[PDB]
């Protein structure tokens, strides 16, 4: 990596002295040393890069977003200096975009990545990075065009294949996504050994009836992406008791279960009132989990946050549930009514995290036709009775009754999570 232009070669002794302070962990002295070099040599690209790297390390030491914001600006200043070597220009702007994403400045990172691609039009890795920038902001349409451009010049780029396959799957192009996800994973290219691609390749195969799906789940488990073949969540705390079905006593949330079962009719009645008089509060399931049928959910809490307008629609239920912070404070779960109508098949799927357990309270259960499988075990609901399962295990639902089926879904923190963990885990 050639990082020194002609001028920087003449001051290499001063640059090496400053960088040695950084390598020895004397970040404050290194910051000041590079600051002096920037003052004395304001056009040195290596002095400016050294200043940004020191600010970067200082932000890590101090855990400071603001210090990192200063480094992000200094990385940009490197790019505007005269005679900047190409390797240094790429390194500086790449780190700038990386740190912008870390801070959540997704629009800023996208502008930096666009600049990089314009400066280095033949660097396909930079285009791949640009596609990731679009994916992080939710712009799957532009991400898809980026990876199409990469695959047109390098058809066997494994990184581009898995991301193109990921986008196809997210768009419900199930059959189309399989060879991209499969060949991309099989390429072994850097960035393809990722649980997200194992997850969706196996799921795409399950949807088309490809029995090879569980061979890929087993491989993802062997490579450390899944806790097991059945439990395939990707946002996990390791060591939590892993079990498809739970009894109330096993969870320890027996007071919550008793309150739900004793008061189930008021929960039902408010749910039916919303069905009859405010049915627009039930929103269709929107995560492509249905093969067919009608399935809607009316959410009272999400990410540990109460929906005030939703609780105006079920005020007694929200008043009841507020007494239980083990569910209202579950920032990795929800509290929601779930209605499902005959002719519905929910694809086998898993939730995103092993940090929650999922309770189902039966409210209106037809006498026949409704059942739920979790792992290798299938059960049914009962009106006024709670079922508890770990939805980080693969689960699947059928509704073949002759009338609607209404349940109440209550997520709780996994009981083995300490209060310190329940407070620090990012919301999902």
């Amino acid at each position: 990596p050639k990082l020194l232009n002609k001028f920087d070669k003449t001051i290499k002794a001063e640059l090496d002295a400053a960088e040695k302070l950084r390598k020895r962990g004397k970040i404050e002295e290194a910051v000041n040393a590079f600051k002096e070099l920037v003052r004395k040599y304001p056009q040195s690209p290596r002095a400016r890069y050294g200043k940004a790297q020191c600010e970067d390390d200082l932000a890590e030491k101090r855990r400071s977003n603001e210090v990192l914001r200063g480094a992000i600006e200094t990385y940009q200043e490197v790019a505007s200096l005269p005679d900047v070597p190409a390797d240094l220009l790429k390194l500086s702007l790449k780190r700038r975009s990386d740190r912008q994403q870390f801070l959540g400045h997704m629009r800023g990172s996208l502008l930096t990545l666009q600049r990089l691609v314009q400066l280095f039009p033949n660097d396909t890795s930079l285009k791949n990075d640009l596609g990731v920038g679009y994916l992080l902001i939710g712009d799957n349409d532009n991400a898809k065009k980026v990876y199409e451009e990469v695959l047109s010049v390098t058809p066997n780029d494994g990184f581009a294949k898995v991301h193109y396959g990921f986008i196809l799957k997210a768009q419900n192009k199930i059959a189309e996504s399989i060879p991209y996800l499969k060949e991309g994973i099989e390429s072994g290219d850097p960035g393809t050994d990722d649980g997200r691609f194992y997850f969706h390749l196996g799921d795409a195969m399950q949807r088309v009836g490809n029995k090879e799906a569980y061979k890929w789940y087993e491989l993802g488990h062997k490579r450390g992406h899944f806790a097991s073949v059945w439990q395939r969540s990707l946002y996990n705390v390791n060591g939590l008791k892993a079990q498809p079905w739970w009894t109330p006593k096993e969870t320890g949330y027996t007071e919550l279960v008793k309150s739900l079962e004793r008061n189930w009719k008021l929960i039902r009645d408010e749910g039916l009132a919303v069905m009859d008089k405010a049915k627009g509060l039930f929103l269709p399931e929107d995560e492509n989990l249905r093969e067919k049928g009608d399935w809607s959910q009316f959410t009272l809490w999400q990410q540990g946050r109460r929906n005030e307008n939703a609780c105006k629609g079920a005020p007694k239920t929200c008043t009841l549930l507020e007494k239980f912070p083990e569910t209202t404070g579950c920032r990795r779960g929800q509290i929601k009514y779930s209605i499902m109508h005959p002719g519905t098949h929910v694809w086998p799927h898993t939730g995103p995290t092993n940090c929650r357990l999922r309770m189902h309270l039966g409210l209106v259960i037809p006498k026949e036709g409704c059942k739920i499988r979790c792992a290798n075990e299938t059960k049914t609901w009962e009106e006024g009775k709670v079922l508890i399962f770990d939805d980080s295990f693969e689960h699947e639902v059928w509704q073949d009754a002759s009338s609607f089926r209404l349940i109440f879904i209550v997520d709780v923190w996994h009981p083995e999570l300490t209060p310190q963990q329940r407070r620090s885990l990012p919301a999902i």
């Binding site: 946002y235 995560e287 995290t353």
Partner: peptide
């Protein structure tokens, strides 16, 4: 988009620095 019931988003958590 949020990962409420599934794992369909590219990332399910938000990025907010340290």
């Amino acid at each position: 988009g949020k990962c409420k019931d599934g794992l369909g988003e590219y990332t399910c958590t938000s990025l907010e620095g340290f």
